[PDB]
């Protein structure tokens, strides 16, 4: 799929990630 | 994504069944989000993902749906549940956004 | 688990003013957080998130360029520093912490603060 | 919001060129690029496309092989590398911005470069 | 997916009305964009997904369409508008692609 | 690390309120302090560590700020208060550097 | 993560434009180095950071790339820089590796 | 608690001149000093340091090999011997005191001197 | 500035060697060194680290357990005690000094010396 | 701090390479040095602060290392220089410690 | 402690300024002093503990430095300052030794 | 994410071929680790990252597999292979979940 | 290399037990460290974790608050101070090492400790 | 540095477990004492670094922790151990502090 938005995803987690 | 809650003001007693639906102009799949804000105070999480409860709220909230058409559900109505709830939304690729809220009023 | 925010008053328009945030109970440095006004006869809306580490923010599309937010995790502080203000910004402002969530799409707000009001008016 | 392309000039057929492109007045870490080619007498033609963070890259059949698309975040600079040099490949190289959409199918190309002049004959 | 714009030069005088028509080989939804290049210069967009307008590019460009017929209206033409313009398409899993352009001279 | 400061000069009258943003190339996290050096003097500490305020300074001033964006806040401006204010930053791995210094004057 | 580099063995002339490329086996993001090994002697830094220089080289040499796609590229080759190139990577939780090198012949 | 400096004046360009520095009213034997230039039509510059030993000592890159800075605890002295000046280096030196912090990432200069005027002219 | 090994030679199998690197014009505690070998026909290959005070150290996969660096800030040397040598370890072993980097990442090696060969035969 | 020495007892015949190994339970820094003691007699200095060698001992003997690993080296193993040989170490704050005692034995 | 000094041999004339720099290859403290020794007398001292003045000198000789770098100043040179220097340190520790000497010529 | 394997015992003969499909209830890509663990013990690593095999294991164990099936694979079974086998996931945002663990037993 | 834990006994409900988990034969203030149940009839399961440095702990959910991990690097040593403990907790506890890993994920636990066993019951 | 010991008021009983436990408001890493002062007597050190024991004390008292969490435990609390037991830092660049401290009773 060469359309698919490239941006960032703003709505990603913003969490802490443990692993 | 604009979000609707209907309807506006909901009038009911203790121990009533208590059913709020928000609706979304655009598919949010099931990602939401369900608000309680009693006056003067700042809103608590009630259900996440539309369908899993905050840990520590009671059993009594529930909530379903997917898509755009979302409910919440309040099996008994208790004289502490009177205040404004919130719908919201936040989509894979959309910003969080709002509802205008509802609010119950003793009958 | 308490989340306090300060920095509240009236200012004219054209004015900045800085807005802050006091975590406590919590490790602040592990969550990304956001701010929130509510707008008497509106509903809610998303104002800025800062990203648990101050690498990536993100605002309303009205407030870019006037709002600029930033944490502190030291002394486990949130600013929401404001300039250029309009009467259109007469709101109550919430602190909002994003739930821990085990996916990578994020999570609701669960903790809300208590809310600082800021009028402008001349 | 500023995108300068540079790098361009003269070579002959069957050297590598590489070009450079940054961007300023904008976050370029939140943002995909594209590069794309107008040769004199026809359209515009699209090259690559970087997925803001390299992870993904797309190529025209024509370039397949023999161009790299990479970007550089910490300096906010784009490269497109032409290995092996073609009279077809005479054209100026335009860089494409990506606009935000809130969907997951992208949106056209918002902010575009003066581009460069490359030009390769004997 | 083959791009042609049509017709490939148009005479216009300031105030005039201006019409492009642009078609696609294949269905391509709504997906498709509008461009305007001055000479020396680079493109610059004005309409995206065929309907809606980018914020800053003045109110008298509009275009729709749907399927495989897209066009572009311009209520008056102005000095300033004397340009090259392009089609483009984003199709579902379709490259990117472009027209061959349309000119406007002036009359 | 290069360091600016604006506006380069900020007329303000006694009462008012003023606030002086600094900005950083880089990101020099919570390190920054801010400077008040009076004409024929020499720059007396007020802010350290972008926060806390250094004994005996007034309490109208206050900053704020991390990362790369950095403002300093006087609540109530005096006629002490005007001389040039300055910004410093001593990241971890990078040496000491000042910004240009913005001059109060009387309205 | 292994590094290798292409071609081995490059003849060019004085004054020609000479580019060696180094590809990297994983992402190594854009933290590499080249050097530059007469015989007989000891490797001396060229670029660091893959584009920028050290300082002392001359303006002549340049470098760029990101990923895992690098390159050196010298615009005027000059009779002192006949010599074997080496290419360095130092990602962040790997160790330093270098590639094979190349010889760089005259013509 | 005063720290005051002296040795300025004119001195033709590739002469050297040497600058002291006396601190009185506080323990100076425990702190890192610093000197800070204040070239009039620019901002402080930073120049040297001094680890409360005269174990360590890092200058800016432009005075490296022409400045040596050396410190004095018996006489609370600091000296900054300045060689082979050119008309650059016609700035105000100050002397810095580097505030105790809690930890080990340093602070910020609290005590600042009152400034001696070099001139370096022919 | 300058970095000059010595120690080499040639040693049996299962023996023991001793390596020595000089550190001449320039503040040589301030720096993490590393150790490179080059073996004919092979590319140069990492050996050990050490972090600036001897606290810290790293070797390669394969020298661990045979290999010790150690350094003597106050007289500006290495030391890469070599023991158990095998037939493999003939090679060309080169001193390298950490550039100095603005950040917390490290960077590249700057100066290098001219190496010692040791051979290890029978 | 508890001073260990290997090999407790190494055999070697004249002309070959002996290396003894001190390691210490705690950093030392560069503070240590070898005895030598023959059998009935006292012990005499070899190596002072680990590296420098004691005025008129025959350029054979050597030593290197830091921190918590120390090594003496002999590159000519004479019949003079068959006898046991102590580490010392006599840290800042610490005080004087010794080693088990290595034995060189002819072969 | 080798005791070196810098330039060996410099030529002034009446009325300029002469800097003089001793260098010592291990740290001296402040423990340092300054002779001249005119051709055919005694070495008389001149600086003391590398910063005093000896009685009777004139005001015109000056010295600073700690550590390992030593310098001497003459402010004005005078037609009886043509002399040779020597630099000598006496540490805790450390026995006396001077410094090669540095003969100041008419210009 | 809830790891159950099955089968929860599989009986088996020496040499002969076993297999243990482990399942996450949620993708978890390539990052999950296999554990033997021989009773009255502590449990040793065999695979990481489901496909790469430990330093020191023996080459029989084998593993295979991504997103929510895995699998282990021992080619011939010997008589120190008669132990639990647990499956261990770590994936992105997720913290470390084992499985129940099955046991082999002796035919 | 070994690991081998301690401190574990049998004391009443709401007690508090402190255990200890000592290293040797590899650099102990190289590697971040986990502590694992394994409560019979039922797998292992995960309780903490301490990040090489002790800056950064996670605890299971239903220990949060009453397990606190806490290492000390110069004496190579664990500790989980165990409060408000419950008849649940009888289980064997296990230290782990996190796997060296080329990559910012982290790696599976490879060094495992014999266990001690921690009963609760009145 | 701020710190804070809790329990304040610990009843226990002769042949008891008893944990006293100290936090500090920042990280003090390793540098922590316990002491122990009967009334009416000077405090006499128990812990010092945290997790060693005072010569002479008995083998009862133990300490844990690092970072900001501490716990004193005493694994058989005896007729002569019914005091007030304090808490105190030593950092690198903190200067001394105590904590209130904490008076066990007889139950």
Redesign the interface.
């Known amino acids: 799929?060469?359309?698919?938005?490239?941006?960032?995803?703003?709505?990603?987690?913003?969490?802490?990630?443990?692993? | 994504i604009q979000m609707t809650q209907s309807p506006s003001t909901l009038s009911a007693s203790v121990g009533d069944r208590v059913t709020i639906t928000c609706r979304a102009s655009q598919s949010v799949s099931t990602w939401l989000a369900w608000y309680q804000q009693k006056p003067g105070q700042g809103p608590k999480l009630l259900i996440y993902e539309a369908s899993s409860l905050e840990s520590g709220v009671p059993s009594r909230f529930s909530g379903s749906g997917s898509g755009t058409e979302f409910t919440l559900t309040i099996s008994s109505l208790q004289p502490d549940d009177f205040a404004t709830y919130y719908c919201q939304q936040y989509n894979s690729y959309s910003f969080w956004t709002f509802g205008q809220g509802t609010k119950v009023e003793i009958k | 688990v308490q989340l306090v925010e300060s920095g509240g008053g009236v200012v004219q328009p054209g004015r900045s003013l800085t807005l802050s945030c006091a975590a406590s109970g919590f490790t602040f440095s592990n969550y990304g957080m956001h701010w929130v006004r509510q707008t008497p006869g509106k509903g809610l809306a998303w104002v800025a998130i800062i990203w648990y580490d101050g690498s990536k923010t993100y605002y309303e599309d009205s407030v870019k360029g006037r709002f600029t937010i930033s944490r502190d995790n030291s002394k486990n502080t949130l600013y929401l520093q404001m300039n250029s203000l309009r009467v259109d910004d007469t709101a109550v402002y919430y602190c909002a912490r994003v739930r821990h969530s085990s996916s990578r799409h994020g999570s609701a707000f669960d903790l809300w603060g208590q809310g600082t009001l800021v009028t402008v008016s001349s």
């Not at chain 1, 799929?1 to 692993?19: I, L, S």
């Open positions: 799929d060469p359309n698919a938005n490239p941006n960032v995803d703003p709505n990603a987690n913003p969490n802490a990630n443990p692993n």
